[PDB]
Every structure is written in structure tokens, then in C-alpha cells.
DNA sequence: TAACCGCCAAGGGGATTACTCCCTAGTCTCCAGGCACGTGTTTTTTTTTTTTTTTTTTTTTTTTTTTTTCCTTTTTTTTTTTTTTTT
């Protein structure tokens, strides 16, 4: 799947992944996404494709 | 108080006559500046293209997502039905 938020400021902000199913009702990623995706997890609305 | 007149005295130079001489009047003859005709090269006028600034027009303003509220006409003129009064 694509994997994306916004705003997309550059090439790295939307990357392929894996699904994974998990229960609960929120996107669960690993940390060193955060650095390329420009996340806080303080809120952050994120798209999936 | 000396203009003016009368009287007298003295002298100076313009008029007159004659001789001379020399400069111009007149007449050829050659030739050259004075003048009639043509025109010019600067001067002004007009176009021509650009320049330079001012003014006007137009277009633009990071992305994604989630809730309410209000409104989505309105007065103003014309028409048409109804009701009341009169003979």
C-alpha cells in the first residue's frame, strides 16, 4: 500500500509498505518513519492508498 | 557818458593793364572694371523615430482534514375576484 502525509514537501514523504493487521483503529508504523514523513504523533492525520 | 558828426591826416590793398604759361577741352583708340544675369549654400521648417517616464491592467497570495449555522428573496405594481350601493 502507499503510505502518505501532508503536506508532501519533498520525494520521501510517501513511501510502499506492508500491511500488518492489528485490532485498534489507528496507523501503527516504526519510529524512523517520522524523520522522512516530518511526523510528531501529537495528532497527525495520515493517508493510506 | 561816448554815440555821432565834422574835420583832417595817412596808408593799404583791390582794381586795372599786360605778359606769360600751363592745364584742361577736344578728339581719337585701346581696353577693363561696372553692371546685367544666373545661382548658391546656409537657414528655417517639417517629419520621424525614439526615449523616458507615468499610468493602467492584471494576476497572485503552502496543502490536507473535521464540526456547526444561515440561507437557498422581496417589495411593488398590476390584475382579478368579491362585496356593497343604487335605481
Given at each position: 500500500?502507499?503510505?502518505?502525509?501532508?503536506?508532501?514537501?519533498?520525494?520521501?514523504?510517501?513511501?510502499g509498505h506492508?500491511?500488518?493487521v492489528?485490532p485498534?483503529?489507528?496507523?501503527?508504523?516504526?519510529l524512523?518513519?517520522?524523520?522522512?514523513?516530518?511526523?510528531?504523533?501529537?495528532?497527525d492525520?495520515?493517508?493510506?492508498?
Amino acid at each position: 500500500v502507499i503510505f502518505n502525509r501532508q503536506p508532501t514537501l519533498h520525494k520521501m514523504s510517501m513511501m510502499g509498505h506492508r500491511v500488518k493487521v492489528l485490532p485498534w483503529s489507528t496507523f501503527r508504523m516504526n519510529l524512523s518513519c517520522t524523520s522522512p514523513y516530518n511526523a510528531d504523533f501529537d495528532g497527525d492525520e495520515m493517508n493510506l492508498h
